[PDB]
Design a protein around this ligand. Sequence first.
Ligand SMILES: NS(=O)(=O)c1cc2c(cc1Cl)N[C@H]([C@H]1C[C@H]3C=C[C@@H]1C3)NS2(=O)=O
Ligand SMILES: NS(=O)(=O)c1cc2c(cc1Cl)N[C@H]([C@H]1C[C@H]3C=C[C@@H]1C3)NS2(=O)=O
Ligand SMILES: N[C@@H](CCC(=O)O)C(=O)O
Ligand SMILES: N[C@@H](CCC(=O)O)C(=O)O
Lengths: 232, 469, 50, 44, 189
Amino acid sequence: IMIKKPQKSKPGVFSFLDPLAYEIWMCIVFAYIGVSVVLFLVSRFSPYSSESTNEFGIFNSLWFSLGAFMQQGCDISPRSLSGRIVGGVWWFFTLIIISSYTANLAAFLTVERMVSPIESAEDLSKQTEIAYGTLDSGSTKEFFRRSKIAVFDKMWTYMRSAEPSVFVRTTAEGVARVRKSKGKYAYLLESTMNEYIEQRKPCDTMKVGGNLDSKGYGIATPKGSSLGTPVN
Amino acid sequence: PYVMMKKNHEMLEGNERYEGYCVDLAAEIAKHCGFKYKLTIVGDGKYGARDADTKIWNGMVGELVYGKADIAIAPLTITLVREEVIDFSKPFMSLGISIMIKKPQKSKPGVFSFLDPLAYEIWMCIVFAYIGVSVVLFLVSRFSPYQSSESTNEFGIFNSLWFSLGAFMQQGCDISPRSLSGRIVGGVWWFFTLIIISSYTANLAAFLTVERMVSPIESAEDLSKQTEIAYGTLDSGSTKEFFRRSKIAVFDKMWTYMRSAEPSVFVRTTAEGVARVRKSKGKYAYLLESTMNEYIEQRKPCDTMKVGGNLDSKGYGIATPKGSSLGTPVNLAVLKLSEQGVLDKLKNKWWYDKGECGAKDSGSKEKTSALSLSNVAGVFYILVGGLGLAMLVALIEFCYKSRLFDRGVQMLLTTVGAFAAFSLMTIAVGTDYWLYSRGVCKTKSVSEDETSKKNEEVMTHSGLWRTCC
Amino acid sequence: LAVLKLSEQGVLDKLKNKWWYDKGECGAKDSGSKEKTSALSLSNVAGVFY
Amino acid sequence: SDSKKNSYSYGWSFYFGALSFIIAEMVGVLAVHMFIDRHKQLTG
Amino acid sequence: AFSLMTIAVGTDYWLYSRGVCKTKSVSEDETSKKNEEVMTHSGLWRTCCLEGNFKGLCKQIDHFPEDADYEADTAEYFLRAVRASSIFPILSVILLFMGGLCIAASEFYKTRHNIILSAGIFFVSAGLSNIIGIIVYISANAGDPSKSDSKKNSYSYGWSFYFGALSFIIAEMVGVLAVHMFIDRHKQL
Ligand SMILES: NS(=O)(=O)c1cc2c(cc1Cl)N[C@H]([C@H]1C[C@H]3C=C[C@@H]1C3)NS2(=O)=O
Ligand SMILES: NS(=O)(=O)c1cc2c(cc1Cl)N[C@H]([C@H]1C[C@H]3C=C[C@@H]1C3)NS2(=O)=O
Ligand SMILES: N[C@@H](CCC(=O)O)C(=O)O
Ligand SMILES: N[C@@H](CCC(=O)O)C(=O)O
């Protein structure tokens, strides 16, 4: 089975910023600014010296809130009751978001490196998304026709009743249909032909599954030719 | 899948125009009984039923009875009134009356989906444990040291809430207990919050992205409970005759609604019934054969979902006229195909190979995507609400400074609470309305006497001591 | 004809589920499959509370 | 099923036991403040 | 800050996506399909479609679409209805207007000693109403995204969304400076 190789995804330089979305990282910075000023506004409020009872200035408030988010913590801790409320909820904000980061970053490290949407010929039979075709007047077309294996008979039934026709004139036209179908088409061809196409550029074809059967290429003579036995 | 037109049917003539499960089965019946057959569609298009007060069978059964046709290999369900007029073979396929509903869109996780990885009873116990540890830490520290000698340690009731909340949220707190058995309170609570948070953060990304099907109606009992979603069945069918002659109380509630429905819920064909399900935006339900229902579901656009299970078991049978001579070899033929797995093979071939949709072929949907702001928005909502609440309390507190319970007043407060705490506890141990659940009811005390089965397991206001219906 | 009359009235279904399940002696009496993602139970973390 | 086979739902008796917990810890907190007050009066 | 927020609410360049264009005016027509969904500079209230003949001309979006085959639940109805009447952005407009009026009132009327605080309260609260305006806007647009789940649409944000974001940041800093003025007036007192 030859299919279009799935696009090789590139991990970005900032791939660590991927588990949360761009709108989330923007709103976290918006939440970081918004909490710090409110903590500043409550703490450096009217006193009734008493104004300087707190150490939570606006530069100190930004530093405490960054310490809370990064889970490291800071020395200053809010002492007034309304100052504790804003410090408490921002802690509750941090616990959910940072854990959602670490759990998704676990998920982005436990990604299965899947390159096979479809696999060996049973999975080809069980799907309708990707069409599969063969070269006309060829042994591969002949093999699926006179077949008794249950999966192969199912594959031949779909190839007969397919619109548009999956059958191709040559292997090169069969390869070209695979490349321009952006991974929605599969083409069934020989293992050594699949090897040579995969080696050559643009190397966008990937051999998938295993050999369905074993066959051979042999030197052919007409029956009753005198040269048949010396060639053999 | 029983009878259908080929892609090239307009050119083709005779038997090749029709193909399908029953068509190939008609080929297998003809070979084993050695006859020649002609495939004809009945002109009316019905499945066969008695007419109302005319006593004429209309459709397929009427085609058999009035001498028009020699055999009916078709989806004809074996029923009592059909058996009386004409013979049936042994059933070639088994089925059930089943419910069809529009496939609901996958529900998004809610606003409060963050508190989902722990259950409701756990979060309540955490809050109760949070209140508990803070009070104990207050009692241990401020307890008559042997003036401000009491006030040397900084653990008041309001600070002890802050230290415990700091320990739970995994944030460093300014204060530390600085006392044996104060440090024991802190250390055990540290071990508490280590395990509880680790259980919380173990799978939080999975819960915030899981998509759950709502499943409005499970089976016929839930279907009867509301008139919001209408339901109907095919006209002149075994399903209509089944609900008509039904004496089961749930099915009795069905047939009353079937007759007294405006506009008429009955559809002349299944294809109109499926089209009515799709275009009614989930306000219509369709009661149909399970074999047809599984076939409609397995093919695209796959916007229909079968719910629950078969209401009853019945069977499709090849039908012959009463007393005919062809039928007894057809009885022989159906038995032979069942033993030779041909009936096994034909059903497995037609349904499974012609699966042409996403739902049947690869039902599983796998994705490992980034979180989006719709997934986590309640925490942003609570934070902005917490910020607004904090400014409000500070403005109120500024009013209080701009403008103390006495000991006798405080003594009044603890006596009201002590009377309340004793009264509420003794009621709770005494009364028996702790839990509402389906439970062992009391038509008879045991559940084993002549199929009691708790008499349909009614809702039961269970108690700590004993259960009560 | 009588087998059909019993089946259509739900009698054969009522006889069937009664004899197997109700006279059966197993404690579970039914089974179901959990979702791959489900919330924790209090019994699963009761040791921490103790 | 997903909490629906029995649909276990707690009642006012269960909630009153939860309310009995909240009142009992508060009157415990109220009592200790009285004893701290008494020891403070005894010291002075 | 009052200028930037009022511009952002009024203009229609919030979001860039393949959206409903004017080939279907109210989206009830036959076979038209919005010319296969051409690029639309969608706004908070408007859906004007660019790269087309009807460039800059549109009809208001209805935030509760029919024929989308849904039944609104409590959570679904609440998020749509807030975004439909867009109260959280326009509250950020009105609160920032009230605080800016108090700033003008603060320079005259000496010895009041609380008005400069109140404008600082309005300025920080206008910012908080702005953030919940943004979060409602993003979470609503996640509903009915595209053929892919919030990916094929590629809903890039226009300068109007960035101005309301910039409106938030400067309103907070002015809210910080109002508190610094209020503290400094108490130290003089
Ligand atoms: N699975 S199915 O519905 O396709 C199906 C249904 C049935 C099958 C075989 C299959 Cl494969 N055989 C039985 C047959 C065995 C004996 C009892 C009834 C007939 C004779 N009929 S059935 O119960 O109607
Ligand atoms: N509940 S069950 O599956 O044991 C069951 C199975 C069957 C029942 C009745 C019950 Cl209760 N009756 C049907 C009957 C209805 C008509 C079709 C087949 C016979 C005549 N046979 S069945 O399909 O074999
Ligand atoms: N080996 C094959 C190649 C062509 C094909 O696969 O159809 C043949 O000679 O027929
Ligand atoms: N196949 C069914 C169709 C009618 C129905 O479902 O009631 C029959 O002929 O009995």
